[PDB]
Paper text:
Cowpea chlorotic mottle virus is an icosahedrally symmetric plant virus in the Bromoviridae family that infects cowpea plants (Vigna unguiculata). The 180 identical capsid proteins are arranged in 12 pentamers and 20 hexamers. The asymmetric unit (highlighted) contains three subunits A, B, and C (magenta, green, and blue, respectively). CCMV is thought to achieve this by detecting a change in its chemical environment upon entering the host cell, which causes its capsid to swell, increasing in diameter by about 10%2.
Once the calcium ions are no longer present to compensate these negative charges, electrostatic repulsion causes the capsid to expand. In the absence of divalent ions, the virus can also be artificially contracted by lowering the pH below 5, which protonates the negatively charged residues and thus removes their repulsion. In contrast, a sample prepared at pH 5.0 yields the structure of the fully contracted state with a diameter of 28 nm. The resolution of 1.6 Å is considerably higher than that of the extended state, which is more flexible and prone to partial disassembly. We then dock atomic models of the extended configuration into slices 1–12 (extended and partially contracted particles) and of the contracted configuration into slices 25–30 (fully contracted particles), from which we determine the motions of the capsid proteins. The contraction of CCMV is accompanied by a simultaneous anticlockwise rotation of the pentamers and hexamers, which are both rotated by about 5 degrees in the fully contracted state. It reveals that the pentamers rotate about twice as fast as the hexamers, adopting a rotation angle of over 3 degrees in slice 12, while the hexamers reach only about 1.5 degrees. This rotation of the capsomeres is accompanied by a superimposed rotation of the capsid subunits around the axes indicated with black arrows in Fig. 4a. However, whereas subunit A has already reached its final rotation angle of ~7 degrees in slice 12, subunits B and C have completed only about half their rotations of ~11 and ~13 degrees, respectively. The process thus resembles a collapse that is triggered when the electrostatic repulsion is removed that keeps the capsid inflated.
Numbering used by the authors:
A (entry chain I), B (entry chain I): 26 to 190
C (entry chain C), D (entry chain C), F (entry chain C): 26 to 189
E (entry chain D), G (entry chain D): 41 to 190
Write the structure that this text describes.
């Protein structure tokens, strides 16, 4: 083949292509504020459904892909790592078996799970999975906000009013 | 015309036909718990958006039809009336100008507003409208739960993940 | 005809079908606040045009149908009745000649006058008709708001600015 | 449309049309006997699967629609209300969030839940939902029988004998 | 000699405000309040077209009288420096026409964001000046039918 | 597919492709000069409309996409970060919820907000959003110029002279 | 009653200048400064069409106030003798429209070659008069896109 000249166009933060939800799915996005932690400790963060997903009908919605990313205070230093895995007996061990890890030392600070949790219900997601957060430096409560974006079947129960009788 | 014989089939509570949201709309349903009130007092209840609708994008979604109904403790006695109207200077006066009133002395305890608030944004709904609740008997806090069902344009911002960059 | 089973679907307050104005007509809606009155007294309420209809031109517009309904404070008890009639010498006698009465003891507290006043002008409506309000219990001022909805030929005076 | 005269034919108790289960579904019907309760108390009644649905396999069957109705002793007086809701911290609060209430003051003492619980399994029905029963007068045990009819995917575990 | 016709699908609502008492050379703020027929939540969303302000003075009112419609000001007298038109009784045509300034805002926004300002070189007794406001706006649809009786 | 050799052609500062406004939109560009701040402090910078957009009519124009980038004095050292978010109770928390951050440690010191603020008016942009600026080292006033480029519906109020 | 529409491919930029303090009967020079959105080298080359000057006075300003746009003068008061239009508060229409005088010059040339002149028979306090300048010019193309991020 003949050499092809290319020009790599720089893009700004936020310009990345957004991953579109599957047909019939929507992406629910919510946050967890980290707890205070000593240096080099890995903390478990429970996954709790937002109120709009906690109803009897909505708890059963099947999960698709899952995205995890971190919101750090601008002054946070050191290494911050986070992942979603099946609940561990030892919190630190989560990073040894996670299929993706959000690590602030990387160019892209985000962990995508396109297959690992597909097909479970939202309730199962809360019961079986845990978020793990590691910091090389001690964390004050709220230093890190964990953003969890969970793709799931679109709820249908709210496509109509409650019958008036 | 020749007389037509008909049989009126009784239906149970809950069997009423559900009003389907308009194409491109969904129905958000949330509750307000009444405050304590003396007998025959009309109380104003602020309309506050649920967390899932409070974002910058979602606050702008246009309203369609609005439904109001009441959840009373089984032991609540006397007359209970509620309505949604433009915010009043005198709370009791709301019932004099409301286009619909949910009244527990009626066979159907519900107030539907198919036209009165169509086209405003959710933020406008919270800023301009108020729920009014009247009881002939004194109310303890939580005696009445006001159910507000607000049809509005389906949010689109959650049809994709946040770009990872 | 064979028997036809039916289900009567419940409907809520506010779900009733709106009556559409005739082509070339519009519905002007305004309110009158009741005066204080003793128990079982019938009070006369003057019909006054809202500002936008009180001009020389607009008060010539012809009336179609007229709707009356009542807004009660939630604490109002007893029987409240209202009607629109030609002005009476004895206020209570209005109810003996009214063709429709708004009565709070009914499921629909409203009175429709589809023919009685058809063809008169808004000025004639204000000059020849009166609203009558009866309460079994004493009324405090503003206890009852009378809603009058008058269908009339759509104004054309409002289709232009005042010349300057 | 020209006026259509109709005759409303009286129908007796028991003549109402039965709601047919969806294709591939069946309706399982069982009862719960109310516990003694003081006047104006709301009691929680656990939803327990009948023996034939309590196996590991059958408790996975998906729910469709749910019907609640009440069987009262003929001497029971006062107001009796019942509903099915997600389990409540305060029993009386169930009626504030129920989408349907069976109420003996109505002509039809029954509550239908056509959507609220659709898709959950029978095990989830037993684990997440509760029956709530309110009486204005004191209840003696067994005064009220709560009839629960749960539509669910037709069992296939019952299509064969236990292997031997 | 010829009235300015409203745009197709629009109509002109005309109402008045009676001036408050004011000392000489004071600029007074006058709130814009919708008439009753426009005060429903639905009618409050009707889009504005053109706006006309003109003044009705008692024939004995002397001195200079000026008025304008502008976005609400921190200093009332400063309205006349930014107003896109001023009704001024010393001119041949005592009126302020705003064909563009407010096009597209809702009646609610008109009432919330704009203020009428009125200046008089001499003291004003209450009701000496009637401010006339004519607001062209989308024709209401909510009042093309009676209120549902149920 | 057979291996495809490529040559990555170097490009200079300023050679990047410009993002074209949507049809019927235009990009308004203005600056805010940073305030003095201590090391590691996050400062809130109010978003104020330029004079030509501050009229009653123009502040109703709907927003499209928003671009943020930073102009640093050549001597500015340390880490400087900035973002646009909904107004925060704690300024430093903006970076935990921002969908994009302009960061001088990157090759491209800019943040694009293609969806977050789509559909709001310019007035709502000024009233609900805030610019947040963080520096690891102390900032002297004017050390950093924040460039905000807001895509919005093309004004039509500017298509005519003021009537006279 | 009807606004003058800009030519196809043109738009009207409108900005203001706050008058300086001035003694009675002095003519003051006011520099024409482009707004920020027009100050880029590219936007400075946009061709001018028509120009409008009008005045916003505090309602209590008395006496005669005049203003014009002309090529910069050695004697400020002499501007009014050669101005092709003068905004004069004693007239019915207080504005100066220049449909031809500056057609085709660039915005840069407008700022460099022309001056606003303001005369008042009485002393002016700073900000008593706001001069409004509306310059029709070719629509900018440079701001139809975001700045390249690299």
């Amino acid at each position: 083949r003949v050499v092809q000249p290319v020009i790599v166009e720089p893009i700004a933060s936020g310009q990345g292509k957004a991953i579109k939800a599957w047909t019939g799915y929507s992406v629910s996005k919510w946050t967890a504020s980290c707890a205070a932690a000593e240096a080099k400790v890995t903390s478990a963060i429970t996954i709790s459904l937002p109120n709009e997903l906690s109803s009897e009908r909505n708890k059963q919605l099947k999960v698709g892909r899952v995205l995890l990313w971190l919101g750090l205070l601008p002054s946070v230093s050191g290494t911050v790592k986070s992942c979603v895995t099946e609940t561990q007996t030892t919190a630190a061990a989560s990073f040894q078996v996670a299929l993706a890890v959000a690590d602030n030392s990387k160019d892209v600070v985000a962990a995508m799970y396109p297959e690992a949790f597909k097909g479970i219900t939202l309730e199962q997601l809360t019961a079986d999975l845990t978020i793990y957060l590691y910091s090389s430096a001690a964390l004050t409560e709220g230093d890190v906000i964990v953003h969890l974006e969970v793709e799931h079947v679109r709820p249908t129960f709210d496509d109509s009013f409650t019958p008036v009788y």
